[PDB]
């Protein structure tokens, strides 16, 4: 059979860890909506917003 299109090599494990504490959930729940659910789910929306925070808000203020 063919190779899979996604893997932990194409996720931000620091973002997943930040979603776990900020959203109050487990890594497997964060990874599920990114791997087998859809990006519009609240756990994947948290991952997107936390990657925006980690890049921008982390530098824009202190």
UniProtKB/Swiss-Prot annotation:
Reproduce the UniProt comment on modification after translation. Answer: Ubiquitinated.
User: Which cysteine pairs make disulfide bonds?
Assistant: none
Give the domain of life: Eukaryota
Q: Where in the cell is it found?
A: Cytoplasm; Nucleus
Q: Which family does it belong to?
A: Belongs to the protein kinase superfamily. CAMK Ser/Thr protein kinase family. SNF1 subfamily.
Q: What is known of its domains?
A: The AIS (autoinhibitory sequence) region shows some sequence similarity with the ubiquitin-associated domains and represses kinase activity.
Q: What does this protein do?
A: Catalytic subunit of AMP-activated protein kinase (AMPK), an energy sensor protein kinase that plays a key role in regulating cellular energy metabolism. In response to reduction of intracellular ATP levels, AMPK activates energy-producing pathways and inhibits energy-consuming processes: inhibits protein, carbohydrate and lipid biosynthesis, as well as cell growth and proliferation. AMPK acts via direct phosphorylation of metabolic enzymes, and by longer-term effects via phosphorylation of transcription regulators.
**What is said about its interaction partners and assembly?**
AMPK is a heterotrimer of an alpha catalytic subunit (PRKAA1 or PRKAA2), a beta (PRKAB1 or PRKAB2) and a gamma non-catalytic subunits (PRKAG1, PRKAG2 or PRKAG3). Interacts with FNIP1 and FNIP2. Associates with internalized insulin receptor/INSR complexes on Golgi/endosomal membranes; PRKAA2/AMPK2 together with ATIC and HACD3/PTPLAD1 is proposed to be part of a signaling network regulating INSR autophosphorylation and endocytosis. Interacts with ARF6.
Can you say what this protein is called?
Answer: 5'-AMP-activated protein kinase catalytic subunit alpha-2
Q: Which organism is it from?
A: Homo sapiens
Instruction: Read off the lineage from the record.
Output: Eukaryota, Metazoa, Chordata, Craniata, Vertebrata
The shown residues of the full protein are 282 to 339 of 552
